[PDB]
């Protein structure tokens, strides 16, 4: 899709083998914010969003948190607190043709900057001046979109690049997108290093008597620390007691 009309695919309820991506040699840009790619294998998320589009090379830099320019402002805006990956690779072989491929567009004018993950696909005539356009182009009345000039002979800066942006949903809900990391058996009444759905800690897991609701995933202490969980594989509730310690 064009950058102004970037596609969004939702990923849910599956195992994400991210090795296939970071071990592939097909990508020029693999930039992960608020996360390390390798670690992805150990992590779960409620949702993943793959935002796909095409831009020119020199604009790849605009696909990053708190960037400015035509793309970052009018086409596709990342939040300043973005937590995810940006993958980009040259697509000169596919998206360029002799004579110039103009199927790919970008928004050139807009009355305001886009909000993070805002999608504007409107074709309203931009009123550059004081005269209302009334949907009629002319002086100070321009079409908001413009084509990319993608020829095979174009400079690498102007060559087409396919971009996928992965956003990860670290929320307080059940996580359906997990890494390939295998599960193990559960041990009770012992000091253990536990990992539930990426939620790591060290404690003693005991049968709880807490009345979790059918929906409630895990519980917290006064300190906003995890005190009790629901096993992802078993609808069983466990209290976590921190491993016995004391001053000596």
């Amino acid at each position: 899709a064009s950058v102004y009309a970037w596609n969004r695919k939702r990923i849910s309820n599956c195992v994400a083998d991210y090795s296939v991506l970071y071990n592939s040699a097909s990508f020029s840009t693999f930039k992960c914010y608020g996360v390390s790619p390798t670690k992805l294998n150990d992590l779960c998320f409620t949702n993943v969003y793959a935002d796909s589009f095409v831009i020119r090379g020199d604009e790849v830099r605009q696909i990053a948190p708190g960037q400015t320019g035509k793309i970052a402002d009018y086409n596709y805006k990342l939040p300043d607190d973005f937590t995810g990956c940006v993958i980009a690779w040259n697509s000169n072989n596919l998206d360029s043709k002799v004579g110039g491929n103009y199927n790919y567009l970008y928004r050139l004018f807009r009355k305001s900057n886009l909000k993070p993950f805002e999608r504007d696909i409107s074709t309203e005539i931009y009123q550059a001046g004081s005269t209302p356009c009334n949907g009629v182009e002319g002086f100070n009345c321009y079409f908001p979109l413009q084509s990319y000039g993608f020829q095979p002979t174009n400079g690498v800066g102007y060559q087409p690049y396919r971009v996928v942006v992965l956003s990860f949903e670290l929320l307080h809900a059940p996580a359906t997108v997990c890494g390939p990391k295998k599960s193990t058996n559960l041990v009770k009444n012992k000091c253990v290093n536990f990992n539930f759905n990426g939620l790591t800690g060290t404690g003693v897991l005991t049968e709880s008597n807490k009345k979790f609701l059918p929906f409630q995933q895990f519980g917290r202490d006064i300190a906003d620390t995890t005190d009790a969980v629901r096993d992802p594989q078993t609808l069983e509730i466990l209290d976590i007691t921190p491993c016995s310690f004391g001053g000596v």
Partner: nanobody, 127 residues
Framework: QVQLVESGGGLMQAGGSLRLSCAVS????????MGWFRQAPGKEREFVAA????????YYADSVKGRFTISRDKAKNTVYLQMNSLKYEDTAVYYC????????????????????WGQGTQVTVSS
């Protein structure tokens, strides 16, 4: 690729009016703009009128402004040139052209090299 087929050319008396048609087939979803051009015997090809596919805003050469009207029917993938107040100087072969290039600036369609061209239709204006 698109195919452009013009029709409606012929002999008309000065002061009369005539509508040319250009039917687009093939990759019709790609259409950004259509343009009409004309070539008189012994003269260079000359821009007449262009229309943006989305919105239908029109741009005209000075020689035809106020006389000619360009229109398009999206559903039928057809562009029309309504040639009112015909003059001797309008005698020429008229060509329709299509581009998938989107310019922010309508006036650029006057000079843009287009992608696909019709076969041409002869208009002859009688004294």
């Amino acid at each position: 690729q698109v195919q452009l087929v013009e029709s409606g050319g012929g002999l008309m008396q000065a002061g009369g009016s005539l509508r040319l048609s250009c039917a687009v087939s093939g990759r019709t979803f790609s259409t950004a703009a259509m343009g009409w051009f004309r070539q008189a015997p012994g003269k260079e090809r000359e821009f007449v009128a262009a229309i943006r596919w989305s919105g239908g805003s029109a741009y005209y050469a000075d020689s035809v402004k106020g006389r000619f009207t360009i229109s398009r029917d999206k559903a039928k993938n057809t562009v029309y040139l309504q040639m009112n107040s015909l003059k001797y100087e309008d005698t020429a072969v008229y060509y329709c052209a299509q581009t998938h290039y989107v310019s922010y600036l309508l006036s650029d369609y006057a000079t843009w090299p287009y992608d696909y061209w019709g076969q041409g239709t002869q208009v002859t204006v009688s004294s």
